[PDB]
Structure 1
Amino acid sequence: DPRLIESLSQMLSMGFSDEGGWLTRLLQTKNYDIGAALDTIQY
């Protein structure tokens, strides 16, 4: 899935981690859209 890959990879490069899959959960909920995930975490 190039969008899991690129969304998660871009957010790891921004310094987020994925302990316990929290960030994978967030991105899945947000359809792998980085902007929506950033909004949700109030970045």
Structure 2
Amino acid sequence: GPLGSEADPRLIESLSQMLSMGFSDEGGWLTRLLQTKNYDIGAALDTIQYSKH
């Protein structure tokens, strides 16, 4: 039962670009997104607009 939330070295690298671009991790949408996009900046940028529809 950890406090707050942790991250990884091969993950924060991506978030650094998102947060600077104008994003965040409210709720945990950018804490797992990158992990699913193989820590990508161009793929994560197109994961906020929508999902399928």
Q: TM-score scaled by structure 2? A: 0.61
Which structure 1 residue ranges, 4+ long, deviate > 2 Å from structure 2?
A: 39-43
In the alignment, structure 2 segments of 5+ residues that lack a partner are 1-7
Identity %, equivalent residues? 100
Report the RMSD for the aligned CA atoms in angstroms: 2.2
For these two proteins, the number of residue pairs brought into alignment is 43
Q: TM-score scaled by structure 1? A: 0.70
Tell me the residue number matched to 1:4.
Answer: 11
In the alignment, structure 1 segments of 5+ residues that lack a partner are none
Structure possessing the higher relative contact order (Cα contacts under 8 Å, 6 or more residues apart): 1
Find the structure with the greater CA-based Rg: 2
